[PDB]
Ligand binder design. Structure first.
Ligand SMILES: [Mg+2]
Ligand SMILES: [Mg+2]
Lengths: 407, 407
């Protein structure tokens, strides 16, 4: 037994067993080469590449390859990958039936259940499970794991879209091999090939949210994977965590708030009210890591501007958000505390205008982040260790059982 | 930002961001009053009561009440609880269809998906989700949470049994209101009221595995619950973790090993071989916490003795296990290194003889542990904090994007 000095910005709880870092805030679980953030400068990298470059020059197909494999693909590697992903988009009939049965339920339950279901009949997954059951994880198993990772990234939009269609009493729209990842998602949701601007927005969103820190969803994936449980189950657990209101829902709440506000003229007073104790907090402003404008927000804001330039801003969402942004950027309270817009400030606007129901916002985040989840699991598996935390017992000992009739 | 002293018996990895406690071994996440283990003396308590006393005088219905509510029930409370649990046993038709669709899959996938499915249409769950979405968790919500916790404990055996039946192409056997929790499970599995001794075995097993500090499955439930995700989703995540070979399988492997050994005469040579590197090693001998005979093992061994005294020991599992146990206990090596049998050394024997397939062993563990999982979640929710661990980036920055054709 040894003592370790752990730096945390979180709250510490007192216990007879020693201090407890509440929510293990800032506690390190591993080193990673997946993504990095410079919170002071407001820079995000995926596998060494700045998000600006990837958003500008790449696609979710290429970025997902980068996140999963650790480098940019060659032309042949990307072509083969795209073709594998296209083939993988379709779900097993049992999975589709699971989704159908959960058509009237919240989409996140359908995602959890569908991911587990799809994992149940995946032959590679079964093979990998057999291998890990005897502690074998060598070249062949790693190949299975990467194939499974690809499948999970490929299938997530299909699960989401199918649920959307069934939930609306619409006929399911199956994946089209001739469409890209983002375009095909919109096609599956709405049954028509999407406008290229709309497709670009989805692709950009997927790129921008592919990996970031170790939120509770990514952490859940690690804990499940740490027992050598399968990749599908690890992603299902990630989705279970993601559905909690403390993980996500900010981009939805930001849009609902903009609608409530109704007029950009209120921006100044809203921002002022947010500087006072008990005041309604501004959704998508401030960040635990970024003490600068979130680079993802800068990029998505520009996409949003393009979207409303083409399709209009009928609910004045972009106007309202823009007015609030300008007040946030000029208010000393926010400036002094380095509180800036984050990507959630903007990202729900296009979704809302595209006709994506609010309840599908978080599922779309899962569509993006699934690649980060699987890449994180595979990385942890390079040096796996089952998680074995503890609790401090403060209950009594040796209570005497009293017969039922005497209680 | 502050520095906290964290004690650990695990491996520490240094990083640019600080020390990494690999697997978060021994890292405190909360104070608890649910269960406690004295590994040196081989004592286990649930809510202050020794496991020996509970195994001797209680039932899973009463022990589950104890674990969930923190005290022993009065006669009226127990009667009412038992009746609620009986009412909750049956699954929603959508859940049954989910299980049917996964009939040919491994039961743990069915459990994960079925638990999510059941939570999807549970009205109480929906109401609790609504409340937590706006940060409300007061008396009314806690009442919902406990109702949901009871449902999860009540339903787990139904899910398991229905999957078993469907996996064998049989019609489901719905829950019998006149049977106890353990007896009803056997009735649902096999379609006949069980022999009292078999029911006792199931009840005992359920009591004995109800909680055991904070393994990866219980931790997974915490991580998911920490986002204020729902109880069903938290349990589905716990199951996902439980499915991993590092979390279970030992009781099955012990039995397969006894079958391979075939003759108790080999006990001495097998145990002698285990004292050399390496090795092989004896299944269910030694424990990370118990440095004494696992109290659960002592109790379950005696039940197993009773079971084979009545029904026989046709595969000589008890004879083989007993021979090995005697050698382990008399060999100085094991005594000196505090290596004793743990519950896994014995617990698969009765199940095997009862006709429970190996793949249902871990599902039955889930039937037991679900009460610990839900109790742990509710406990955490008394002072919830979302888990916020982090990873330390090690790798390049500012790599230059190269056009596809030039790679
Ligand atoms: Mg522009
Ligand atoms: Mg006896």
């Amino acid at each position: 037994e040894q003592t370790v000095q752990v730096k945390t910005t979180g709250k510490i709880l007192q216990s007879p067993c020693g201090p407890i870092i509440h929510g293990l805030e800032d506690v390190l679980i591993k080193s990673t080469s997946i993504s990095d953030i410079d919170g002071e400068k407001g820079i995000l990298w995926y596998r060494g590449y700045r998000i600006e470059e990837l958003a500008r020059l790449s696609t979710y197909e290429e970025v997902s390859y980068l996140i999963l494999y650790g480098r940019l693909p060659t032309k042949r590697e990307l072509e083969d990958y795209i073709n594998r992903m296209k083939k993988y988009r379709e779900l097993h009939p049992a999975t589709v039936e699971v989704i159908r049965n959960l058509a009237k339920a919240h989409p996140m339950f359908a995602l959890e259940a569908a991911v587990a279901a799809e994992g149940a009949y995946d032959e590679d997954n079964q093979k990998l499970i057999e291998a890990l059951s005897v502690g074998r994880y060598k070249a062949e198993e790693k190949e299975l794991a990467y194939r499974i990772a690809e499948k999970l990234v490929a299938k997530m939009p299909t699960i989401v879209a199918y649920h959307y269609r069934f939930s609306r009493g619409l006929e399911v729209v199956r994946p089209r091999d001739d469409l890209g990842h983002a375009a095909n998602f919109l096609y599956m949701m709405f049954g028509r090939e999407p406008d290229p601007l709309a497709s670009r927005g989805i692709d950009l969103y997927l790129i921008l949210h592919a990996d970031h820190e170790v939120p509770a969803s990514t952490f859940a994936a690690h804990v499940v994977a740490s027992t050598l449980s399968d990749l599908y189950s690890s992603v299902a657990a990630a989705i279970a965590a993601l559905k909690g209101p403390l993980h996500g829902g900010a981009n939805e709440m930001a849009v609902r708030n903009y609608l409530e506000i109704g007029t950009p003229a209120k921006a100044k007073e809203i921002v002022e009210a947010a500087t006072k104790p008990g005041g309604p907090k501004l959704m998508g402003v401030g960040h635990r890591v970024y003490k600068a404008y979130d680079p993802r927000a800068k990029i998505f804001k520009e996409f949003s501007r393009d979207y409303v330039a083409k399709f209009g801003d009928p609910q004045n969402l972009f106007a309202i958000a823009s007015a609030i942004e300008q007040e946030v950027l000029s208010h000393p309270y926010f400036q002094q505390r380095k509180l800036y817009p984050n990507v959630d400030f903007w990202s729900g606007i296009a979704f809302y205008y595209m006709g994506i129901p609010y309840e599908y916002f978080t599922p779309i985040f899962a569509m993006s982040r699934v690649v980060g989840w699987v890449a994180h699991v595979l990385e942890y598996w390079e040096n796996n260790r089952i998680f074995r935390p503890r609790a401090c017992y403060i209950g009594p000992h040796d209570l005497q059982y009293i017969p039922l009739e005497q209680r």
